[PDB]
């Protein structure tokens, strides 16, 4: 999977367009030097009014700027020399519970909230394995956070013996997003 950003050299897609899939320091050499409309297919991209990037920055997401003033707002330019995709730091906290060992059957992935009743999300599933990709997570037996309890930590569990479970049964998960030193 690459980013895909498509500059176009007049207003509304039209003229000739160029793609670029990483970073371009000078957009004379894409043979548009000046866009007129800008398409993102995958980012986020950060342009610049000046080549090397420098000057002036716009960021553009995934959609339509049809026109030059459509990603900049205080115009001592309507110029745009270079872009690069953004290596955006967006952290998530995942949990993916498994219906048979080994991470096999159906799943369910959980990010950052809390799950009080697993067959509120259609889950009704036995939980047998569970990989804790990111976060600190307590698994309990009955929907509510009650019953056995069993700490999910960053890791692997193959089976629902390696969390402490008598038998594969989990149906809420809470994260533990708190700790005092």
Known sequence: LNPKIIIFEQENFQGHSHELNGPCPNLKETGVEKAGSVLVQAGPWVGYEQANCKGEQFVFEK???????SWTSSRRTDSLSSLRPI???????????????????????????????????????????????????????YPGY??????????????????????????????????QW
């Open 63 to 69: 959609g339509e700027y049809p026109r030059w003033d």
């Open 87 to 141: 290596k955006v730091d967006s952290q998530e906290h995942k949990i993916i519970l498994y219906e048979n060992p080994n991470f096999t059957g159906k799943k369910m992935e959980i990010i950052d909230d809390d799950v009080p009743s697993f067959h509120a999300h259609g889950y009704q599933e036995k939980v047998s394995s569970v990989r804790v990709q990111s976060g600190t997570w307590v698994g309990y037996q």
């Open 146 to 179: 009650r019953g056995l309890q069993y700490l999910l930590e960053k890791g692997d569990y193959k089976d629902s013996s390696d969390f402490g479970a008598p038998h594969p049964q989990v149906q809420s998960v809470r994260r533990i997003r708190d700790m």
